């Protein structure tokens, strides 16, 4: 039953990877929802829509890289339901950016816990995988989202629809 | 509350589109599972893996086009959980192809019912959307999968691991 | 008297096509009026002017394609007066966009009725002509105009002349 | 016995497709006859000959696309004898064009009946296949042939051998 | 109420320009009718059709340039109904050319009266606008149409359908 | 009644050419049937299908060259019904290749008889036409088909579906 390739790969690490795969797919689905919210005729912020669609695809890529990891190490992927996002209506560009920031920080926290587990199980390959492909990506994403939220707030979002319009044009466009 | 763009778009059609979006996302997730099954070290059919990964991405594209439709017509997207696939282990190239064929026929049946609803609601735009973007795509996908299943069976899959190996190389490669 | 090419083309369909030709020419004339309203020295929104002039030419193209249809089927074109637009003065970028949206929805309703007639007369060629060349075009135009109206309103049009200025620059330019 | 790919494809539709295949092959053979009539030394209208030969090959393509359809849907092709054309000697450029027009209208009528059957059997894929690939093609072919017949008649065919000569040169050449 | 740009622009000139705009749009519509007459399957003179369609578009360009003039001078455009053309059926290539010649001479007469008004109101800008953009254009158009009519008549139009055929090919093609 | 170009062209030769035209069209139709047999979802040998479709088109070309011959010599083409092929279902790649070989040998025998007739009628032009365009073509086709049949048999067709699969890939692909 044990994979011929498996070496120094703890069952707990395998399970945590499966959980991270689900979380990445969940994040992808959240971003998809946000994108198409901004595509609504009564919201109509095309560059917000594009920004979040790109993020959705990137999150899918992250999940697939974790699946590849799982198979490389000889673990077995076990997929779960991808839960629907918390909202259907994201209310504003600013609110969407804040929710994205919160999501990214949650994903980062899960990654940090994964790293802690890898460290505890003396799995340096897994640790460096997380470090190389995930942690800096998260730090960058969080910094970018924080920058966006800051600009929107200073511009006067969400009450200034002009604010969101011009942010859509000049930052996200 | 009614969208400014909405015209000749029945609530039942809107709901059916939301169901189709979920079904397309489900199909994408099924194909993702199959792809990474073939990426396992104890299965190791890279071109099967690639074939199903491509199909997964294509299904995601189909879902996104339906979401775009929904917003174009002034309906509102309501996302649901994406259920996990029926299997974790797809057993063989042939079995995966047969399950894919079954899935594609189920998706096609749902599309046909959607078309019937559009027709009943006298929604020619929706009918032609389905016709143009979905129905022929489905017919082609079903024919291709049937061709694959036929070849694998004639070659001697799934007992002939040589059969699947050579199919992976010569058809899917 | 009956055209040598005519086949499965009902008199009622022919008459409805003649009405649609007139409606398309009318829409082209409305858009022409709007364009040159924005060219006034006391309005001076060049990109609004360009947007509506492009729309005018596109509507002319639609009418000409219907005339070509009529001759292809062996019907006979009967032209009518092109009525002058409802306004000389369109008041604002937002008001013009709202009137354009209303016009586009009226044109769409007429197209839907034309499709219904074709269906009732079992004229699949005519149905698919309408579907292929007109219905999606209308859906897109309505969605775009709705997006424009939404943005202008959120920006603060028509009281914010800055709003219309910046929309002219960043969206229509 | 039922094809693994077959879905929503009525036996009556399958039979009608087989009949249409035969009709398209028949039309191809008629045009072949006309082409080589104009290649006779005592007729000697090379561009008529080329025009009808092109039409013959196009009709063959139409038949082959229907065969491909049949297999795509999981129906089974049953071929029949291709009947010889009604004439060996087509008498004149004008007479050939009139017979071609009559043939094209007969083919169109058969296509319309096929569409009606598809509609009655709620086969939207088949309907849109016919609509996309056949109906407009027929309308165009009929209009072109009607234009040709009109010009020949106005020029003075078939008594003015100069008429046919110059039509061969300037229209068909 | 007076435009900030208006200078040396008499109310009578403004009104005459509005009348000329309507006349140019009328001429465009007449030429459109003629074009699609020649597109009929029972007339079938493609190059006549093209010639008149080009003329239609050119006349629309003339109208739009007058509208631009009106706004440049600070007058206000007031559009009127575009009357339907005098005929639905233009009978022959020659008859259409003669009606076009008559139309062009009427347009020219109106332009000459406009010039006379400009001169009487000491509006040298308007005079030179008319001179530069319109008068020579009209002279050329009238000369060309007269040349066409002369050739058709000498060839034997409209009784020689060969005449019109060959004119369509060699002059208009 | 006798063609102005006819010289040294016996009535018996003319009749034999008409028979050969029909036989070539028959062969084309047989190959068409075989091609689309291999396009079936339950057969699914794309390169067999392509091979036989190419052969079908080549046979049509042969028939058309014979028609051109007939007119060049001043004979008159008389077309007959094209009989349907002997089978609807060709059973296997090997069986299809064997039937094709048999067909090609029958066509060759008919050509040899045609040559014998030409020789007996002292028609060296006809003899050399047959020699140049047909006889070597037939010899090559027969040799190729024999090679194919030999390979399939040695590989283990038709019981080894792997055999036909790999032949389709490596020889016909
Ligand atoms: Mg490190
Ligand atoms: Mg700005
Ligand atoms: Mg359709
Ligand atoms: Mg000449
Ligand atoms: Mg020799
Ligand atoms: Na991520
Ligand atoms: Na799909
Ligand atoms: Na339109
Ligand atoms: Na056809
Ligand atoms: Na003019
Ligand atoms: Na042959």
């Amino acid at each position: 039953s044990t994979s011929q390739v498996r070496q120094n790969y703890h069952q707990d690490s395998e399970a945590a990877i499966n959980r991270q795969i689900n979380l990445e797919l969940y994040a992808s689905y959240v971003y998809l929802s946000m994108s198409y919210y901004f595509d609504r005729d009564d919201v109509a912020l095309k560059n917000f829509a594009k920004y979040f669609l790109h993020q959705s695809h990137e999150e899918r890529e992250h999940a697939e890289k974790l699946m590849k990891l799982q198979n490389q190490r000889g673990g077995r992927i076990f997929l779960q339901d991808i839960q629907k996002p918390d909202c259907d209506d994201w209310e504003s560009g600013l609110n969407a950016m804040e929710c994205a920031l919160h999501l990214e920080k949650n994903v980062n926290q899960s990654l940090l816990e994964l790293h802690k587990l890898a460290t505890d199980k003396n799995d340096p390959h897994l640790c460096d995988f997380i470090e190389t492909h995930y942690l800096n990506e998260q730090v960058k994403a969080i910094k970018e989202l924080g920058d966006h939220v800051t600009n929107l707030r200073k511009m006067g979002a969400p009450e200034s629809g002009l604010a969101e319009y011009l942010f859509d044009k000049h930052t996200l466009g």
Side-chain angles (χ1 to χ4, degrees), chain A residues 89-114:
Chain A
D89 170 4
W90 298 96
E91 309 183 350
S92 69
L94 175 57
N95 182 70
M97 286 283 177
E98 292 175 328
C99 299
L101 176 59
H102 183 270
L103 174 64
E104 290 293 354
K105 292 187 89 185
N106 279 1
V107 172
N108 196 39
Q109 185 61 15
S110 177
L111 291 159
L112 296 166
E113 297 166 4
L114 182 53

PDB file of all heavy atoms in Angstrom, chain A residues 89-114:
ATOM      1  N   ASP A  89     -23.082  38.957  -2.954  1.00  0.00           N
ATOM      2  CA  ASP A  89     -22.980  40.379  -3.254  1.00  0.00           C
ATOM      3  C   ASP A  89     -21.872  40.971  -2.393  1.00  0.00           C
ATOM      4  O   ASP A  89     -21.964  40.959  -1.166  1.00  0.00           O
ATOM      5  CB  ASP A  89     -24.346  41.021  -2.980  1.00  0.00           C
ATOM      6  CG  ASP A  89     -24.344  42.540  -3.007  1.00  0.00           C
ATOM      7  OD1 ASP A  89     -23.321  43.188  -3.301  1.00  0.00           O
ATOM      8  OD2 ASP A  89     -25.425  43.089  -2.725  1.00  0.00           O
ATOM      9  N   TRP A  90     -20.836  41.495  -3.039  1.00  0.00           N
ATOM     10  CA  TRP A  90     -19.650  41.962  -2.337  1.00  0.00           C
ATOM     11  C   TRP A  90     -19.666  43.459  -2.041  1.00  0.00           C
ATOM     12  O   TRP A  90     -18.661  43.991  -1.569  1.00  0.00           O
ATOM     13  CB  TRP A  90     -18.399  41.576  -3.134  1.00  0.00           C
ATOM     14  CG  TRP A  90     -18.288  40.102  -3.243  1.00  0.00           C
ATOM     15  CD1 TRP A  90     -18.701  39.325  -4.282  1.00  0.00           C
ATOM     16  CD2 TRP A  90     -17.768  39.210  -2.255  1.00  0.00           C
ATOM     17  NE1 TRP A  90     -18.457  38.003  -4.014  1.00  0.00           N
ATOM     18  CE2 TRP A  90     -17.880  37.904  -2.773  1.00  0.00           C
ATOM     19  CE3 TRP A  90     -17.210  39.388  -0.990  1.00  0.00           C
ATOM     20  CZ2 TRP A  90     -17.457  36.787  -2.065  1.00  0.00           C
ATOM     21  CZ3 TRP A  90     -16.789  38.269  -0.287  1.00  0.00           C
ATOM     22  CH2 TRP A  90     -16.917  36.991  -0.825  1.00  0.00           C
ATOM     23  N   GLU A  91     -20.751  44.149  -2.390  1.00  0.00           N
ATOM     24  CA  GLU A  91     -21.104  45.499  -1.941  1.00  0.00           C
ATOM     25  C   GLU A  91     -20.309  46.640  -2.563  1.00  0.00           C
ATOM     26  O   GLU A  91     -20.891  47.670  -2.908  1.00  0.00           O
ATOM     27  CB  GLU A  91     -20.985  45.575  -0.421  1.00  0.00           C
ATOM     28  CG  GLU A  91     -21.738  44.457   0.255  1.00  0.00           C
ATOM     29  CD  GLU A  91     -21.699  44.538   1.759  1.00  0.00           C
ATOM     30  OE1 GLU A  91     -20.926  45.363   2.289  1.00  0.00           O
ATOM     31  OE2 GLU A  91     -22.439  43.762   2.405  1.00  0.00           O
ATOM     32  N   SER A  92     -19.004  46.477  -2.744  1.00  0.00           N
ATOM     33  CA  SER A  92     -18.180  47.595  -3.196  1.00  0.00           C
ATOM     34  C   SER A  92     -16.794  47.084  -3.537  1.00  0.00           C
ATOM     35  O   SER A  92     -16.391  46.000  -3.112  1.00  0.00           O
ATOM     36  CB  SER A  92     -18.076  48.709  -2.148  1.00  0.00           C
ATOM     37  OG  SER A  92     -17.327  48.273  -1.031  1.00  0.00           O
ATOM     38  N   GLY A  93     -16.070  47.890  -4.311  1.00  0.00           N
ATOM     39  CA  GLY A  93     -14.682  47.566  -4.584  1.00  0.00           C
ATOM     40  C   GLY A  93     -13.866  47.456  -3.312  1.00  0.00           C
ATOM     41  O   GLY A  93     -13.082  46.521  -3.132  1.00  0.00           O
ATOM     42  N   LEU A  94     -14.048  48.417  -2.411  1.00  0.00           N
ATOM     43  CA  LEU A  94     -13.316  48.415  -1.150  1.00  0.00           C
ATOM     44  C   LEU A  94     -13.663  47.199  -0.312  1.00  0.00           C
ATOM     45  O   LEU A  94     -12.782  46.564   0.271  1.00  0.00           O
ATOM     46  CB  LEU A  94     -13.620  49.690  -0.373  1.00  0.00           C
ATOM     47  CG  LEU A  94     -13.034  49.811   1.029  1.00  0.00           C
ATOM     48  CD1 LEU A  94     -11.521  49.670   1.004  1.00  0.00           C
ATOM     49  CD2 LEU A  94     -13.457  51.140   1.607  1.00  0.00           C
ATOM     50  N   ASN A  95     -14.955  46.894  -0.187  1.00  0.00           N
ATOM     51  CA  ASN A  95     -15.342  45.750   0.631  1.00  0.00           C
ATOM     52  C   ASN A  95     -14.765  44.472   0.053  1.00  0.00           C
ATOM     53  O   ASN A  95     -14.315  43.594   0.794  1.00  0.00           O
ATOM     54  CB  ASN A  95     -16.858  45.633   0.742  1.00  0.00           C
ATOM     55  CG  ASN A  95     -17.284  44.467   1.635  1.00  0.00           C
ATOM     56  OD1 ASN A  95     -17.106  44.510   2.845  1.00  0.00           O
ATOM     57  ND2 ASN A  95     -17.835  43.424   1.036  1.00  0.00           N
ATOM     58  N   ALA A  96     -14.777  44.347  -1.275  1.00  0.00           N
ATOM     59  CA  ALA A  96     -14.203  43.162  -1.897  1.00  0.00           C
ATOM     60  C   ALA A  96     -12.715  43.077  -1.606  1.00  0.00           C
ATOM     61  O   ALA A  96     -12.191  42.000  -1.322  1.00  0.00           O
ATOM     62  CB  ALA A  96     -14.451  43.170  -3.405  1.00  0.00           C
ATOM     63  N   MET A  97     -12.015  44.203  -1.696  1.00  0.00           N
ATOM     64  CA  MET A  97     -10.585  44.191  -1.424  1.00  0.00           C
ATOM     65  C   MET A  97     -10.313  43.812   0.028  1.00  0.00           C
ATOM     66  O   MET A  97      -9.370  43.073   0.315  1.00  0.00           O
ATOM     67  CB  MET A  97      -9.984  45.552  -1.767  1.00  0.00           C
ATOM     68  CG  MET A  97      -9.880  45.758  -3.274  1.00  0.00           C
ATOM     69  SD  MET A  97      -8.515  44.871  -4.023  1.00  0.00           S
ATOM     70  CE  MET A  97      -8.761  45.264  -5.769  1.00  0.00           C
ATOM     71  N   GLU A  98     -11.119  44.328   0.961  1.00  0.00           N
ATOM     72  CA  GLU A  98     -10.939  43.963   2.364  1.00  0.00           C
ATOM     73  C   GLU A  98     -11.191  42.480   2.592  1.00  0.00           C
ATOM     74  O   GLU A  98     -10.446  41.825   3.331  1.00  0.00           O
ATOM     75  CB  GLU A  98     -11.844  44.806   3.254  1.00  0.00           C
ATOM     76  CG  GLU A  98     -11.450  46.249   3.285  1.00  0.00           C
ATOM     77  CD  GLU A  98     -12.409  47.126   4.058  1.00  0.00           C
ATOM     78  OE1 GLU A  98     -13.625  46.840   4.079  1.00  0.00           O
ATOM     79  OE2 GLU A  98     -11.941  48.115   4.649  1.00  0.00           O
ATOM     80  N   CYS A  99     -12.237  41.926   1.967  1.00  0.00           N
ATOM     81  CA  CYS A  99     -12.490  40.498   2.122  1.00  0.00           C
ATOM     82  C   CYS A  99     -11.369  39.681   1.503  1.00  0.00           C
ATOM     83  O   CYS A  99     -10.983  38.643   2.046  1.00  0.00           O
ATOM     84  CB  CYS A  99     -13.833  40.110   1.512  1.00  0.00           C
ATOM     85  SG  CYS A  99     -15.245  40.930   2.272  1.00  0.00           S
ATOM     86  N   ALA A 100     -10.847  40.127   0.363  1.00  0.00           N
ATOM     87  CA  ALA A 100      -9.717  39.439  -0.242  1.00  0.00           C
ATOM     88  C   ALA A 100      -8.515  39.468   0.689  1.00  0.00           C
ATOM     89  O   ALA A 100      -7.796  38.478   0.812  1.00  0.00           O
ATOM     90  CB  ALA A 100      -9.377  40.058  -1.593  1.00  0.00           C
ATOM     91  N   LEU A 101      -8.245  40.618   1.300  1.00  0.00           N
ATOM     92  CA  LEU A 101      -7.135  40.714   2.241  1.00  0.00           C
ATOM     93  C   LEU A 101      -7.321  39.739   3.393  1.00  0.00           C
ATOM     94  O   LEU A 101      -6.390  39.034   3.791  1.00  0.00           O
ATOM     95  CB  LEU A 101      -7.020  42.138   2.770  1.00  0.00           C
ATOM     96  CG  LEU A 101      -5.972  42.388   3.849  1.00  0.00           C
ATOM     97  CD1 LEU A 101      -4.572  42.040   3.361  1.00  0.00           C
ATOM     98  CD2 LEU A 101      -6.051  43.831   4.312  1.00  0.00           C
ATOM     99  N   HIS A 102      -8.533  39.700   3.945  1.00  0.00           N
ATOM    100  CA  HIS A 102      -8.820  38.776   5.037  1.00  0.00           C
ATOM    101  C   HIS A 102      -8.608  37.332   4.596  1.00  0.00           C
ATOM    102  O   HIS A 102      -8.005  36.529   5.320  1.00  0.00           O
ATOM    103  CB  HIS A 102     -10.243  38.998   5.536  1.00  0.00           C
ATOM    104  CG  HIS A 102     -10.614  38.136   6.702  1.00  0.00           C
ATOM    105  ND1 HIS A 102     -11.188  36.892   6.563  1.00  0.00           N
ATOM    106  CD2 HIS A 102     -10.462  38.333   8.034  1.00  0.00           C
ATOM    107  CE1 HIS A 102     -11.393  36.367   7.758  1.00  0.00           C
ATOM    108  NE2 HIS A 102     -10.959  37.220   8.667  1.00  0.00           N
ATOM    109  N   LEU A 103      -9.096  36.993   3.405  1.00  0.00           N
ATOM    110  CA  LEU A 103      -8.921  35.650   2.865  1.00  0.00           C
ATOM    111  C   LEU A 103      -7.446  35.311   2.722  1.00  0.00           C
ATOM    112  O   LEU A 103      -7.007  34.214   3.084  1.00  0.00           O
ATOM    113  CB  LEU A 103      -9.602  35.555   1.503  1.00  0.00           C
ATOM    114  CG  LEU A 103      -9.422  34.263   0.714  1.00  0.00           C
ATOM    115  CD1 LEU A 103     -10.050  33.088   1.469  1.00  0.00           C
ATOM    116  CD2 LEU A 103     -10.012  34.418  -0.665  1.00  0.00           C
ATOM    117  N   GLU A 104      -6.677  36.231   2.147  1.00  0.00           N
ATOM    118  CA  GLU A 104      -5.259  35.978   1.934  1.00  0.00           C
ATOM    119  C   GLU A 104      -4.542  35.779   3.263  1.00  0.00           C
ATOM    120  O   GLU A 104      -3.640  34.945   3.368  1.00  0.00           O
ATOM    121  CB  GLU A 104      -4.639  37.124   1.144  1.00  0.00           C
ATOM    122  CG  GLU A 104      -5.097  37.176  -0.305  1.00  0.00           C
ATOM    123  CD  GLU A 104      -4.624  36.018  -1.162  1.00  0.00           C
ATOM    124  OE1 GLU A 104      -3.825  35.192  -0.687  1.00  0.00           O
ATOM    125  OE2 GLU A 104      -5.058  35.938  -2.335  1.00  0.00           O
ATOM    126  N   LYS A 105      -4.913  36.552   4.286  1.00  0.00           N
ATOM    127  CA  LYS A 105      -4.293  36.349   5.592  1.00  0.00           C
ATOM    128  C   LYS A 105      -4.679  35.000   6.190  1.00  0.00           C
ATOM    129  O   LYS A 105      -3.855  34.350   6.840  1.00  0.00           O
ATOM    130  CB  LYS A 105      -4.639  37.493   6.547  1.00  0.00           C
ATOM    131  CG  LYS A 105      -4.015  38.819   6.142  1.00  0.00           C
ATOM    132  CD  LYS A 105      -4.206  39.913   7.180  1.00  0.00           C
ATOM    133  CE  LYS A 105      -3.062  39.885   8.183  1.00  0.00           C
ATOM    134  NZ  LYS A 105      -3.255  40.853   9.296  1.00  0.00           N
ATOM    135  N   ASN A 106      -5.917  34.550   5.965  1.00  0.00           N
ATOM    136  CA  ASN A 106      -6.299  33.224   6.450  1.00  0.00           C
ATOM    137  C   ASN A 106      -5.514  32.130   5.746  1.00  0.00           C
ATOM    138  O   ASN A 106      -5.052  31.170   6.380  1.00  0.00           O
ATOM    139  CB  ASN A 106      -7.796  32.996   6.245  1.00  0.00           C
ATOM    140  CG  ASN A 106      -8.637  33.645   7.318  1.00  0.00           C
ATOM    141  OD1 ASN A 106      -8.119  34.281   8.225  1.00  0.00           O
ATOM    142  ND2 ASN A 106      -9.952  33.464   7.229  1.00  0.00           N
ATOM    143  N   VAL A 107      -5.346  32.268   4.436  1.00  0.00           N
ATOM    144  CA  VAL A 107      -4.569  31.294   3.688  1.00  0.00           C
ATOM    145  C   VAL A 107      -3.141  31.286   4.205  1.00  0.00           C
ATOM    146  O   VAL A 107      -2.540  30.225   4.399  1.00  0.00           O
ATOM    147  CB  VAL A 107      -4.639  31.597   2.181  1.00  0.00           C
ATOM    148  CG1 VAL A 107      -3.691  30.707   1.429  1.00  0.00           C
ATOM    149  CG2 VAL A 107      -6.076  31.437   1.677  1.00  0.00           C
ATOM    150  N   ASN A 108      -2.580  32.476   4.435  1.00  0.00           N
ATOM    151  CA  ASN A 108      -1.225  32.577   4.960  1.00  0.00           C
ATOM    152  C   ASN A 108      -1.101  31.892   6.319  1.00  0.00           C
ATOM    153  O   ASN A 108      -0.117  31.205   6.580  1.00  0.00           O
ATOM    154  CB  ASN A 108      -0.809  34.042   5.073  1.00  0.00           C
ATOM    155  CG  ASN A 108       0.682  34.204   5.243  1.00  0.00           C
ATOM    156  OD1 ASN A 108       1.452  33.483   4.622  1.00  0.00           O
ATOM    157  ND2 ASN A 108       1.094  35.160   6.064  1.00  0.00           N
ATOM    158  N   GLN A 109      -2.068  32.110   7.208  1.00  0.00           N
ATOM    159  CA  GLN A 109      -2.025  31.458   8.512  1.00  0.00           C
ATOM    160  C   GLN A 109      -2.017  29.945   8.352  1.00  0.00           C
ATOM    161  O   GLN A 109      -1.292  29.235   9.057  1.00  0.00           O
ATOM    162  CB  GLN A 109      -3.223  31.889   9.357  1.00  0.00           C
ATOM    163  CG  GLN A 109      -3.217  31.354  10.792  1.00  0.00           C
ATOM    164  CD  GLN A 109      -2.017  31.818  11.607  1.00  0.00           C
ATOM    165  OE1 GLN A 109      -1.306  32.745  11.224  1.00  0.00           O
ATOM    166  NE2 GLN A 109      -1.807  31.188  12.756  1.00  0.00           N
ATOM    167  N   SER A 110      -2.841  29.433   7.441  1.00  0.00           N
ATOM    168  CA  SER A 110      -2.843  27.993   7.217  1.00  0.00           C
ATOM    169  C   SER A 110      -1.490  27.515   6.702  1.00  0.00           C
ATOM    170  O   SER A 110      -0.994  26.467   7.122  1.00  0.00           O
ATOM    171  CB  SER A 110      -3.949  27.618   6.233  1.00  0.00           C
ATOM    172  OG  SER A 110      -3.933  26.235   5.953  1.00  0.00           O
ATOM    173  N   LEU A 111      -0.883  28.271   5.785  1.00  0.00           N
ATOM    174  CA  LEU A 111       0.446  27.920   5.293  1.00  0.00           C
ATOM    175  C   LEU A 111       1.480  27.916   6.405  1.00  0.00           C
ATOM    176  O   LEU A 111       2.361  27.056   6.435  1.00  0.00           O
ATOM    177  CB  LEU A 111       0.887  28.850   4.172  1.00  0.00           C
ATOM    178  CG  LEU A 111       0.044  28.618   2.926  1.00  0.00           C
ATOM    179  CD1 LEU A 111       0.071  29.816   1.995  1.00  0.00           C
ATOM    180  CD2 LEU A 111       0.483  27.330   2.231  1.00  0.00           C
ATOM    181  N   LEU A 112       1.449  28.922   7.269  1.00  0.00           N
ATOM    182  CA  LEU A 112       2.368  28.951   8.399  1.00  0.00           C
ATOM    183  C   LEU A 112       2.195  27.725   9.284  1.00  0.00           C
ATOM    184  O   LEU A 112       3.179  27.149   9.750  1.00  0.00           O
ATOM    185  CB  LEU A 112       2.184  30.232   9.201  1.00  0.00           C
ATOM    186  CG  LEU A 112       2.543  31.437   8.343  1.00  0.00           C
ATOM    187  CD1 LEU A 112       2.042  32.717   8.985  1.00  0.00           C
ATOM    188  CD2 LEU A 112       4.042  31.477   8.094  1.00  0.00           C
ATOM    189  N   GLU A 113       0.954  27.332   9.549  1.00  0.00           N
ATOM    190  CA  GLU A 113       0.733  26.123  10.337  1.00  0.00           C
ATOM    191  C   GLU A 113       1.267  24.889   9.616  1.00  0.00           C
ATOM    192  O   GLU A 113       1.820  23.982  10.243  1.00  0.00           O
ATOM    193  CB  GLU A 113      -0.757  25.994  10.631  1.00  0.00           C
ATOM    194  CG  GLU A 113      -1.236  27.160  11.460  1.00  0.00           C
ATOM    195  CD  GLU A 113      -2.741  27.278  11.522  1.00  0.00           C
ATOM    196  OE1 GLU A 113      -3.441  26.395  10.982  1.00  0.00           O
ATOM    197  OE2 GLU A 113      -3.216  28.268  12.110  1.00  0.00           O
ATOM    198  N   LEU A 114       1.080  24.828   8.300  1.00  0.00           N
ATOM    199  CA  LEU A 114       1.639  23.734   7.516  1.00  0.00           C
ATOM    200  C   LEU A 114       3.158  23.687   7.660  1.00  0.00           C
ATOM    201  O   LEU A 114       3.744  22.615   7.827  1.00  0.00           O
ATOM    202  CB  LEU A 114       1.216  23.886   6.056  1.00  0.00           C
ATOM    203  CG  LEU A 114       1.660  22.824   5.069  1.00  0.00           C
ATOM    204  CD1 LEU A 114       1.262  21.485   5.595  1.00  0.00           C
ATOM    205  CD2 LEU A 114       1.015  23.091   3.708  1.00  0.00           C
TER     206      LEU A 114
END
